[PDB]
């Protein structure tokens, strides 16, 4: 089909934004060890919201890209509106760039004033630092986008793949409405904040990623739609059975009742299972592959995604999910380590996977790229992926020493925050080095196009 | 074992647990007045929360262990800088003197806060430290 073309600007923008994201990562990583670097021009927190908002926005773009590509091909018709996909692309790209420029060009409190945050205060919450107008604007794009892609499912074939995608997509936008909800009570504010963050990334986003994985497996493997769609349902069943009460592993120390200690620890113990199943999924359906596929990279992206998401979300998640352990590690470099690997392995990787599949045939080049371009992709994959295991190993070592020095001993014996950080310096240099190997991988991946 | 079987497991499991979760939510919600001492949650502390947000403290600090890992935990800073009695006075000095300009040290910004604002901040932080947090953090260092 031809309206599948509108997915191209989405994937290309996502990759540009991904570059931006890494650059601001590298700025913060230097700030860790040369504390006054770029100060007072770009204080750490400004660099941070740029890094974290570019991460969320680029992945969102990748998701819309992924939908715009596979939804026509599942629905067995043209996308409801190629021209809507294009207005929406430009609106979303303008709002992203505008709010990012806001961050860098006006001190945060000033940006707050300037956007009339006093009337509807939603600003200055982690991952939610965008002005209420930006948030409001993001909802409108979501509505447009949902109408566009969801009309296409309505007037066409319904497959489980597209159904599950739509459910994830709808749930993502719905839960985003909680960002408009900013309670005056601190623990209430934190309680509802996780309905965005956790119910996305360990719930509704897992539906999106499963769907994209399943579609790609269908197209690369020639194994029967029926079995693939069955496992999809198993995987997402396990995601929401573990993950919904699972939200409780964020409810240990925010000020909610101690029953969450049990509920959070026990349901979370099971949250690795869907990622384990995605590894059995991709590995099995790829080795029971009824055919060969001219693009060997997609197959690698798909297996890699599942192994990394399982390491990052599953193993690292579990490693700190039990309350008696989380008590010591909560809000520590361990958190940053888990967070980097989980976000990269599950979500950055599944976006690059669908791009691997969809790019050559969006650029009317065919199923696969020439065999020189295919080895670059593979190099940028090993470079990005290995670099990230190193990033997470160094931050893991950092968090272990941080917990040992600062969290374990009693008052008097425990080291102070700033003193502990100086002791961690070497781990932060290494992470920065790894962050350099990663950019090199991203450039290598980019130069494969 | 069929697709159909798998889809109904998905359906039932998710509705059941969606409902379990809301019931727990409702309950939790009713306990919050006591756990968080909402009696003390004055106009001053609610304005402090606004200052906290308006300046993105959380982009550098953790509060109750959530936020950024660049700078110290502020949930229990009260106890490490002169307690109930003198914390407001400390904070007033603390916000004025920034940045400290020690070469190579992690820097905090000058926020040009008025003293009303800094006082509201202090009340907010003081109140935060008194939330029943199931005894988190482990010690006075946060």
């Amino acid at each position: 089909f031809a309206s599948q073309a509108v997915a191209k600007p989405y994937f290309v923008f996502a990759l540009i934004l991904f570059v931006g994201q890494i650059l601001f990562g590298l700025i913060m990583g230097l700030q860790y060890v040369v504390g006054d670097f770029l100060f007072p021009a770009i204080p750490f927190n400004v660099a941070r919201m740029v890094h974290t908002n570019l991460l969320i926005v680029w992945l969102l773009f990748g998701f819309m890209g992924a939908a715009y590509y596979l939804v026509p091909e599942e629905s067995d018709c043209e996308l409801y509106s190629p021209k809507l996909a294009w207005i929406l692309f430009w609106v979303f790209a303008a709002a992203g760039v505008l709010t990012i420029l806001g961050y860098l060009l006006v001190p945060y409190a000033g940006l707050a004033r300037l956007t009339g945050n006093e009337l509807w205060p939603t600003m200055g919450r982690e991952f939610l630092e965008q002005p209420t107008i930006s948030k409001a604007g993001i909802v409108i794009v979501a509505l447009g986008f949902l109408f566009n892609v969801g009309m296409t499912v309505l007037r066409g074939r319904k497959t489980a793949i597209s159904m599950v995608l739509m459910t994830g997509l709808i749930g993502l936008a719905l839960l985003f409405l909680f960002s408009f909800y900013n309670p005056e009570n601190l623990t209430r504010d934190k309680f509802y904040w996780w309905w965005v963050v956790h119910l996305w990334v360990e719930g509704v986003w897992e539906l999106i990623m499963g769907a994209i994985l399943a579609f790609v497996l269908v197209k690369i493997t020639g194994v029967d739609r029926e079995v693939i769609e069955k496992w999809l349902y198993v995987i997402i069943a396990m995601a929401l059975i573990s993950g919904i009460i699972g939200t409780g592993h964020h409810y240990f120390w925010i000020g909610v009742p101690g029953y969450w200690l049990w509920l959070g620890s026990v349901f979370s113990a099971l949250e690795p299972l869907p990622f384990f199943a995605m590894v059995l999924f991709a590995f099995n359906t790829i080795n029971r592959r009824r055919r060969d596929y001219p693009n060997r990279a997609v197959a690698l992206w798909a297996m890699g995604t599942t192994v990394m998401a399982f390491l990052g979300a599953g193993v690292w998640g579990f490693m700190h999910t039990l309350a008696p352990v989380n008590y010591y590690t909560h809000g520590t470099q361990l958190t940053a380590a888990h967070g980097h690997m989980a976000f990269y392995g599950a979500y950055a990787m599944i976006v690059m996977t669908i791009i691997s599949y969809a790019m050559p045939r969006l650029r009317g080049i065919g199923e696969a790229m020439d065999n020189r371009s295919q080895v670059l992709e593979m190099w940028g994959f090993w470079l990005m992926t290995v670099a990230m295991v190193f990033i997470t190993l160094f931050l893991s070592a950092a968090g272990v020493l941080q917990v040992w020095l600062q969290r374990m001993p009693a008052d008097g014996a425990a080291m102070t925050f700033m003193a502990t950080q100086d002791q961690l310096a070497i781990f932060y240099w290494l992470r920065e080095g790894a962050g350099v190997v990663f950019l090199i991988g991203l450039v290598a991946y980019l130069l494969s196009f | 074992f069929t697709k159909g079987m798998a889809r109904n497991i998905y359906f039932g499991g998710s509705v059941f647990f969606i409902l379990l979760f809301l019931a727990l939510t409702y309950h939790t919600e009713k306990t919050l007045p006591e756990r968080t001492n909402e009696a003390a949650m004055s106009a001053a502390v609610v304005r402090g929360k606004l200052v906290w947000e308006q300046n993105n403290c959380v982009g550098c600090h953790t509060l109750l262990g959530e936020g950024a890992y660049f700078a110290p935990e502020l949930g229990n800073v009260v106890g490490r800088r002169g307690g109930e009695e003198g914390f407001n006075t400390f904070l007033q000095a603390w916000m004025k003197i920034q940045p400290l300009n020690v070469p190579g040290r992690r820097a905090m910004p000058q926020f040009h806060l008025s003293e009303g604002q800094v006082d509201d901040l202090a009340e907010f932080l003081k109140w935060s430290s008194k939330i029943d947090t199931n005894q988190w953090p482990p010690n006075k260092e946060g």
Partner: antibody
Amino acid sequence: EVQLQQSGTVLARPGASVKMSCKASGYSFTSYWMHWVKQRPGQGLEWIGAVYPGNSDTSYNQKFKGKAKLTAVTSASTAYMELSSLTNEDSAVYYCSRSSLDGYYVKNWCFDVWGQGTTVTVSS
Amino acid sequence: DIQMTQSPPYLAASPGETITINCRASKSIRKYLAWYQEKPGKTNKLLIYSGSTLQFGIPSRFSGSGSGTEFTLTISSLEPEDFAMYYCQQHNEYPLTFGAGTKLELKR
């Protein structure tokens, strides 16, 4: 309340050695440089050196490299200074003091708490 | 080593008056100069650091300024407890060094 409690007056013969202590309370002993400072009467303060109990590293004024040895015992929050091969010129008050800022890389800063001083009288 | 000259060495003044005392450094110490107050039977008390930053708890009648090479300390309206010995210390470079002091005396 941050306090530094120094040991009492010591008398020694020329060429001998002397060891004094500084007992720290009310803070994270391992998170701050301990400084030592010499004052002979009508003579202006002189910085001898410092020890970082968090890793045992030390730093000495070139003028005191031979003279002074600094150590710390972390379980007791006590810092120590040993002065060797004494001379009339080592008769003085000796202060310990805590860096006002925590961490290893603030070695050259100012001090916010001082002990009351240990007198060393070198005489025959 | 950077050497430090305080002047004057003695200054007589009265309660309610304003004085200002000087500190000079033999080379640039950027802005990094602290002041201590010394009194008999009390431990030395940090007053100002980084040239003009008041230390927590110190009354606002004390202030200081300077950079590079020349620094001053002012007390705005002398109080009885301010008659004391004052030392400056550079905190820009190894090895730390101190001025020899200005003694502020009660005029009668």
